[PDB]
Amino acid sequence: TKQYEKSENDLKALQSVGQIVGEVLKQLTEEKFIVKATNGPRYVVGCRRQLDKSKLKPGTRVALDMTTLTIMRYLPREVDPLVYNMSHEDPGNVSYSEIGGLSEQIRELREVIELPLTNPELFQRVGIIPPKGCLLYGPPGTGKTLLARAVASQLDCNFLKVVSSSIVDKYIGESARLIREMFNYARDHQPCIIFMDEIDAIGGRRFSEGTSADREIQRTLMELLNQMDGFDTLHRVKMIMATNRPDTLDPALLRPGRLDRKIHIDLPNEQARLDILKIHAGPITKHGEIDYEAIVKLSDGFNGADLRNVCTEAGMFAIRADHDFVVQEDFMKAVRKVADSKKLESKLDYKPV
Amino acid sequence: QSEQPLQVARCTKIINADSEDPKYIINVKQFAKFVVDLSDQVAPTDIEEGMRVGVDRNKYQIHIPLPPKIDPTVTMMQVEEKPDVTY
Amino acid sequence: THELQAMKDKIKENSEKIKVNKTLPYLVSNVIELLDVDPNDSQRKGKCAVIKTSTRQTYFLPVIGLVDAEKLKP
Amino acid sequence: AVQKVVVHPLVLLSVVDHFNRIGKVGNQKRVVGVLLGSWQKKVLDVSNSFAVPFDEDDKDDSVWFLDHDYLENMYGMFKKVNARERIVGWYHTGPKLHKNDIAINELMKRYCPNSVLVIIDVKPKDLGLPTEAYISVEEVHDDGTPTSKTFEHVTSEIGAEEAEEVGVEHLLRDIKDTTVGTLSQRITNQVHGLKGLNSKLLDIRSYLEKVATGKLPINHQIIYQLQDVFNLLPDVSLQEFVKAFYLKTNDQMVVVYLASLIRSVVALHNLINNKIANRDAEKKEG
Ligand SMILES: Nc1ncnc2c1ncn2[C@@H]1O[C@H](COP(=O)(O)OP(=O)(O)OP(=O)(O)O)[C@@H](O)[C@H]1O
């Protein structure tokens, strides 16, 4: 029962008041150390006898006391968006080769990513600069989020994710230090891979500057433009971006450097649609008599999200008939009808609104 | 003689959730959240979610709920003042 | 084996001091996961964490005490 | 284990003010209390403590009583005000310990793994830095005795702390501080020879005393082993400095040159600026 006495004595040590944290700036002398608290005041204070030479550091966060503001222990500094960035997930592996097309985009994205990791020798011996970035835009077909994130999730602890909602951040919020942090940790984990999706809102041009909120978009831009075209070495880390249209990217992003390789997604083709139907027919049960050319021919110019989810819509029409294994006749009904209904809903392609 | 009391009334704060019957939580202008009991002068049924109430900064228990607040600066003008244009 | 009750009284009085720690916070904090051990310079071992505030300040206090670091993600 | 300890003047007076307690009411023995230590590192530090009623019979020289009811509850009183503060051992004012102290330390080893007793001095006399520190270990012995518990001397040094120099350093007020650079180093030179050569003469007289009687101590061997470390140079007549002679004045080389060179410029600052400023005010006044 002495564990209670042990537990309460540990809570007696909890009577010790907590301290405050700050960032070291410089040092005037041994008895005065410039430290900037997270609030922004800067103090020059002494120190106690329990610390070492590793406490000083070149501008690293420290914990200031609440009385004399002296430093107790030092800890590594992070603003910690990254743990939130690593909270993503995705199956595959397999989903790499499941899309089926285009075969040239399947093989190339495997090279520019994996080859610099395993074989740097080809770059240094031939004397060529490997691509440090890439651009995958849409939606002329699917595979943007599927193929890129598959290698991401398979690369495990080495990856960086960016959602377009985190750039605006909060009122009078600072995303300029996020752009510098995103590329700072990109230079830590190697090779790092960064995904930026739906940049049309956060890629704001400075031609027409609305209200007070367009400039803070330009600030996040110029922070991206500086480090991607640096002057700061990104050669080992790979970057990826995504957008609906490259209208607002400006000559800065449309240029090479910051955006290196722009690979346009291609819609599924009758030859390639035969492969994507094989992977769709796996999870769904079918009748013993099935023809893959029937579904491929009846559905043309449809994205992979259209084909899959309508093939599940065919299963929802199949459960309307309660049959477990269903012939493709009931499928071709639900596949053609529901898909042709989707075509009269959204205008594009080809006509803009 | 009434100097000390009624001073503690600050500040105005909106409650959010209740962990138990005696204890609630209130968001206060200091930007934190106020986990509070209530004085014997006010029944627990008078404190409901999304209500502005008072406090006693000494004992920290709730003092009295204050419902009223009227408009921002923009809509207080939008309120009608006097009749005009009679038919 | 009768020392239990006298020892059980101090855990409630210390909890009574937690009951005055119950009433009442003016501060709400954000949590940051941290693991820190400093060799000196006989040995002091343990774990510490980083603590934010609603007033924009960021404080420094050892790992709580009460609820441990097993839960949860910050 | 425990290498060195740090004793503050605050806890020391806590032994001294209790000497005014048992001093006016009597009678025998001395001041004995339980020591509250603070361990932040291998070096030991002591801040506060509490004095406990204690008595030791003469006859009956081995009889001693600590009060554990005063030791238990008051610890919780101090544990509540100071969590890091805990009892590191006991203490007493000596001046000379008795063999019964083996029982006082072994009884309190249930509270702390190793109890360090501190012998203090209420009236400073001789020969030097006061009080004392002892640690309890077992060295057995070379002669074949049963396992022997003998307190080994621990180097003790006084130390200061913030906010505790308010009243302490104010009340004295009579000391001249420091003053480094003139009288500070030259006073110790008269002291380092005094205190250095008296313990010399005191120990060499005891070394001669070991021949007559008092053998053992044999010692062994620390007496002559550490003496021969002093014997790297004796130094004996005369100084054997034939190799260190031309080097001697060579150490006085820079010292005399910096003296004469700077003093000539200091004179140029003292003489010139004085005659200028003096001729200014003198002849222009009348
Ligand atoms: N060929 C496919 N096979 C399996 N699932 C797919 C396929 N295409 C799309 N999906 C599903 O659709 C979701 C979105 O994929 P992706 O980003 O590649 O297309 P998209 O950009 O959403 O297309 P659109 O913009 O036309 O909706 C994914 O979660 C995926 O599960």
Gaps in chain C after residue (C–N beyond 2.5 Å): 41
Taking the CB of residue D259, how many other CB atoms lie within 10 A of it?
Answer: 11
Distance from CA of D83 to the nearest CA of A (A): 5
Residue with tokens 């608290």: A37
d(CA A36, CA A71): 12
Distance CA A323, CA C36 (A): 61
The Cα–Cα gap between A263 and A265 comes to 6
What is the amino acid identity at position D240? E
Smallest Cα distance from A74 to chain C, Å: 8
Burial of D228 (0-12, 13-18, 19+ CB in 10 A): exposed
For residues A10 and C65, what is the distance between their CA atoms, to the nearest angstrom? 8
Give the experimental resolution in Å. Answer: 8.0
State the CB neighbour count (10 A cutoff) for residue A136.
22
What is the sign, positive or negative, of the torsion defined by CA atoms of A110, A112, A117, A123? Answer: positive
Distances (CA, A) of A233 to A123, A194, A219, A258: 15, 15, 21, 12
Between CA D98 and CA D106, with CA D104 as vertex, the angle to 5 degrees is 120
Q: How far is CA A322 from the centre of its chain?
A: 41
Beta bridge partners of A23: A36, A61
Specify the residue with its C-alpha closest to ligand 1, atom 9. A305
Which among D40, D41, D79 has CB closest to A12?
D79
D52-61, long-range: CB within 8 Å, 24+ apart, which pairs?
Answer: D54/D29, D55/D28, D55/D29, D56/D28, D56/D29, D56/D32, D56/D98, D56/D100, D58/D28, D61/D98, D61/D99, D61/D100
Q: How many CA atoms lie within 13 A of D243 on its CB side?
A: 2
The CA–CA distances, whole Å, from D117 to A257, D42, D61, D103, D153 equal 74, 16, 19, 12, 10
* Dihedral, CA of residue D231, residue D232, residue D237 and residue D239, to nearest 10: -140
Q: Take residue D136 and report the two structure tokens written for it.
A: 């309890």
Residues whose CB is less than 8 angstroms from the CB of residue D31 and which lie 6 or more positions away in sequence, other chains included: D15, D18, D19, D22, D51, D54, D92, D93, D122
In 10 A of CB D71, how many CB atoms?
17
Give the separation between CA D156 and CA D147, rounded to whole angstroms: 27
Hey, are the CB atoms on A50 and D40 less than 8 Å from each other?
yes
> D178 burial class (0-12, 13-18, 19+ CB within 10 angstroms)?
exposed
What residues in D contact A50, CB-CB < 8 Å?
Answer: 40-41
CA distance A268 to A274: 9
Bridge-based pairing state of the strands A193-196 and A238-241: parallel
Q: Tell me which residues have their CB closer than 6 angstroms to ligand 1.
A: A 99, 138-139, 142-146, 276, 303-305, 308
Tally of CA atoms within 13 A in the half-sphere of A59 that contains its CB: 1
State how far the alpha carbon of A278 is from the alpha carbons of A19, A292, A293, A319, in Å: 61, 8, 11, 21
Alpha carbon distance D281, D286 (integer Å): 9
Q: Are D133 and D153 in contact (CB under 8 A)?
A: yes
Which helix (DSSP H) or strand (DSSP E) does residue A170 occupy? none
Q: Residue B22 forms beta bridges with which residues?
A: none
User: Chain C contact for A19, CB < 8 A?
Assistant: yes
Helical residues (DSSP H) of chain A, grouped into ranges: 2-13, 82-85, 95-98, 103-118, 121-126, 144-154, 165-168, 176-186, 215-228, 250-254, 270-280, 292-298, 304-320, 328-343
Asked if C24's CB is within 8 angstroms of B36's CB, the reply is yes
Query: Looking at ligand 1, which atom is closest to the CA of residue A139?
Result: 25
- How far apart are alpha carbons A85 and A196 in whole angstroms? 12
d(CA D149, CA D146): 10
The pair of structure tokens assigned to D80 is 């509540």
Structure tokens at D70: 């005063």
d(CA C57, CA C26): 13
CA distances from A190 to A87, A109, A350 (A): 19, 17, 41
A115 assigned to a ligand binding site? no
Two tokens, residue A348: 């594009």
CB of B32 within 8 Å of any CB in chain C? yes
Tokens (6 digits) for D13? 């007076």
Give the C-alpha separation, A12 to D40, whole Å. 17
Give A38's DSSP letter.
Answer: T
Contact A50 D41 (CB under 8 A): yes
Q: Can you say whether the dihedral through the CA atoms of A197, A202, A203, A208 is positive or negative?
A: positive
Cβ density class D209-223: b for 16+ within 10 Å, e for less: eeeeeeeeeeeeeee
CA separation for the pair D67, D81 (Å, rounded):
21
Chain A residues whose beta carbon lies within 8 Å of the beta carbon of residue C59: 18-21
B1–chain C Cβ distance below 8 A for any pair? no
Interface test with D, best of C3, C9, C41, C42 (most D CBs within 10 A): C42
A325 close to A286: Cβ distance less than 8 angstroms: yes
Question: Any idea what DSSP says for residue A54?
Answer: G
Backbone angles phi, psi at D221, to 5 degrees: -100, 5
Cis peptide before A253 (omega within 30 of 0): no
Q: How far is CA C18 from the centre of its chain?
A: 12
**Which H/E stretch holds residue C50?**
strand C48-52
Q: What are phi and psi of A134, to 5 degrees?
A: -155, 160
Experimental determination approach used: cryo-EM
Nearest to C31 by CA among C7, C6, C67: C67
Give the Å distances, CA to CA, from B72 to B10, B27, B41, B79. Answer: 20, 20, 31, 11
Strand D5-7 and strand D156-158: the pairing is: parallel
- For ligand 1, the distance from its centroid to the CA atom of residue D173, given in whole angstroms, is 85
- Residue A262: C-alpha distances to residues A113, A131, C45 (Å): 14, 11, 52
Name the 3-class secondary structure at D121.
Answer: coil
D123 CB burial (10 A radius; 0-12, 13-18, 19+): exposed
Q: A14 to chain C: nearest residue by CA? A: C65
Is residue A131 classed as helix, strand or coil in its secondary structure? coil
> Is A198 part of any known ligand binding site?
yes
| Share in percent of chain D as helix, strand, coil (round to 5) | 45, 15, 40
Nearest CA residue ID for atom 27, ligand 1: A305
The chains found to touch A (3+ Cβ pairs under 8 angstroms) are C, D
Structure-token pair, residue B47: 């404190």
d(CA A241, CA D132): 73
CA triple A30-A31-A36, angle to 5 deg: 95
Nearest to C14 by CA among A107, D266, A8, A150: A8
Cβ atoms of residues A290 and A311 within 8 Å: no
What is the DSSP-derived secondary structure letter of residue B65?
B
What whole-number distance in Å separates Cα of residue D70 and Cα of residue D84?
Answer: 20
User: What gap in Å lies between CA A173 and CA A157, rounded to an integer?
Assistant: 28
Q: Long-range pairs for A127-133 at CB < 8 Å and ≥24 separation?
A: A129/A235, A130/A235, A131/A238, A131/A260, A131/A261, A132/A234, A132/A235, A132/A236, A132/A237, A132/A238, A132/A239, A132/A260, A133/A228, A133/A234, A133/A238, A133/A239, A133/A240, A133/A241, A133/A257, A133/A258, A133/A259, A133/A260, A133/A261
Contact B56, B38 (CB under 8 A): no
> Chain D: nearest CA to A33, how far in angstroms?
20
Residue D149's closest CA among D90, D97, D105? Answer: D105
What 3-state class would DSSP assign to A193? strand
Q: Beta B13-15 vs A238-241: how paired, if at all?
A: unpaired
Q: How buried is residue A26: exposed, middle or buried, by Cβ count under 10 Å (0-12/13-18/19+)?
A: middle
Residue numbers in A near D79 (CB within 8 A):
9, 12
Instruction: Give chain A positions within 8 Å (CB) of C51.
Output: 18
Q: Is A308 annotated as a binding residue?
A: yes
Three-point CA angle A293, A297, A299, nearest 5°: 120
In angstroms, the Cα distances linking D286 to A265, C14, D282 are 104, 85, 7
Whose structure tokens read 């740097």? A120
Q: Note whether A23 and A61 are within 8 A (CB).
A: yes
Q: Check if the beta carbon of residue B21 is closer than 8 Å to that of residue B11.
A: no
Distance from CA of D89 to the nearest CA of C (A): 18
Q: Does B33 touch chain C (CB under 8 A)?
A: yes
Q: Tokens 């329990």 correspond to what residue?
A: A50
Query: Looking at this protein, which amino acid is placed at residue A153?
Result: S
Q: How far apart are the first and last CA of chain D?
A: 80
Separation between Cα atoms, residue D7 and residue D120, nearest integer Å: 10
Contacts of D40 in chain A (CB under 8 A): 50
Give dist(CA C39, CA C49) in Å, integer: 17
| Pairs across C and D, CB distance < 8 A | 6
C61 pairs with which residues across the strands?
C49
Element (H, E) at A24: strand A19-27
Asked if C74 contacts A41 with a C-beta cutoff of 8 angstroms, the reply is no
Whether the Cβ atoms of residue D33 and residue D49 lie closer than 8 Å to each other = yes
Residue D123 DSSP SS3:
coil
Q: Measure the CA–CA gap between D40 and D36, rounded to whole angstroms.
A: 13
DSSP-assigned letter for residue A129: P
- The β-bridge relationship of strands A71-74 and A61-64 is antiparallel
